[PDB]
Design a protein around this ligand. Structure first.
Ligand SMILES: C=C[C@@H](O)CCCCC
Ligand SMILES: C=C[C@H](O)CCCCC
Lengths: 159, 155
């Protein structure tokens, strides 16, 4: 018998996430204009389909791009996805607030690059949301006069 | 199992805007002065001040702005920005900030705003796990990019 099945419930970790650090065995991949200089925005985990949808932004050729990548889990436990080549992604450490991962990428020229990363989740609690909505109602502010800054196209550029 | 000692200064660091509401919609519309994306907040218990670092788009371009607020005896804070402001903290903890701001502009017009902000917390052990994995893979420290500080100091 090899290892046993892992009870996986990552669905609730879905939500807004941000990149803290990304390291690489090949500096070119994460330098300015690099394909892996990725600013995370959102992660969605589906325990039933065994997938993870990545939503992030990257600057290419002097232009900002919003990207969406779908990863599929394997018996191996790792995830595979297509993005600037083939990728084998492993979650090394995970909690309600952080994600530490290791990714192996092989580009169109067979070049292998190993990357490490630390991402943090932006947790918005129900208790705090309720406090905000009550206060907003107390001040006579209409719901239509409230702007969402977490999911908004018009935002500042990191570079 | 351990947690850092609770200090008001421990609340300083990267913060992000979640929601901002206004009695005057024009103030938070595109190019409005209060459509602020927070970057960092610095709390100083000694001086009774809070330094705000945010970005706001004006005339089609993003600007980085710094505002220093000073605490009053009644616990509220006063700050000069697009007129006079009295900022009150309604709820505050290690991860969230709910506030109410009263602004009176250069024309005597009053606007009341509400806001919800969240702190981005990076724990020591998580950082250590990242650095250990990074060295396990033979990655040089100079081959690591700090995305968080880039977002905290945009252009
Ligand atoms: C491999 C998928 C990309 O969208 C993420 C790259 C960052 C992980 C180090
Ligand atoms: C007064 C300076 C602060 O940045 C005010 C922001 C108001 C948000 C509710």
């Amino acid at each position: 018998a090899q290892e046993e099945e892992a009870e996986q419930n990552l669905s609730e970790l879905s939500g807004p996430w941000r990149t803290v650090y990304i390291g690489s065995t090949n500096p070119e991949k994460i330098q300015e204009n690099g394909p892996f200089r990725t600013y995370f925005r959102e992660l969605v985990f589906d325990d039933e389909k065994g997938t993870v949808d990545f939503y992030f932004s990257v600057k290419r050729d002097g232009k900002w791009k919003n990207v969406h990548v779908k990863a599929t889990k394997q018996d191996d436990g790792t995830y595979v996805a297509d993005y600037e080549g083939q990728n084998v992604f492993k979650i090394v450490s995970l909690s309600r607030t952080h994600l530490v991962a290791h990714n192996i990428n092989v580009d169109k020229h067979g070049q292998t690059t190993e990357l490490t990363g630390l991402f943090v989740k932006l947790n918005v609690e129900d208790e705090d949301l309720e406090k905000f909505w009550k206060l907003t109602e107390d001040k006579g502010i209409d719901k239509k006069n409230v702007v969402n800054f977490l999911e908004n196209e018009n935002h500042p550029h990191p570079e």
